[PDB]
Design a protein around this ligand. Structure first.
Ligand SMILES: *[C@@]12=NC3=[C]C([C])=C([C])[C]=C3N([C][C]([O])[C]([O])[C]([O])[C]OP([O])([O])=O)C1=NC(=O)[N]C2=O
Length: 109
């Protein structure tokens, strides 16, 4: 299939830090687990990232609904790539959101 990555965000903490990321996420972004785990994914953003699309993610996270946006992210070396982000809320049996899982595809073509 297509080349994608995978991360898990812990919604029980107020800012949804990352608790697990697939090896492709580390290889794609240039960042390692010692600089990714425990942080919000927004470190990938930079100057050309649209504050409108970023707002669609923030609202969906606060509302506990899924979202799919096209962002401009930056590797550790500062080079830009285009990220097709899709975040999905994972809820407990009582309806509360516990984790946020996101698939990231580099659609720079
Ligand atoms: C990021 N991937 C990513 C993966 C998951 C599972 C979640 C929940 C979020 C992301 N983001 C967005 C980021 O964490 C944050 O939610 C946004 O910056 C919007 O919130 P604020 O209020 O801080 O602006 C991802 N953002 C990226 O740029 N790249 C991803 O791969």
């Amino acid at each position: 299939g297509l080349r994608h990555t995978f991360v898990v965000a812990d919604a029980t903490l107020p800012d949804c830090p990352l608790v697990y990321a697939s090896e492709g996420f580390y290889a794609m972004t240039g960042y390692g687990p010692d600089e990714v785990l425990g942080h919000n994914c927004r470190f990938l953003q930079g100057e050309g990232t649209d504050p409108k699309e970023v707002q669609k993610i923030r609202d969906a996270i606060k509302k506990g609904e899924a979202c799919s946006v096209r962002l401009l992210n930056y590797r550790k070396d500062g080079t830009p790539f285009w990220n097709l982000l899709t975040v999905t809320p994972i809820k407990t049996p009582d309806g509360r959101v516990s984790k946020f899982v996101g698939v990231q595809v580099d659609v720079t073509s």
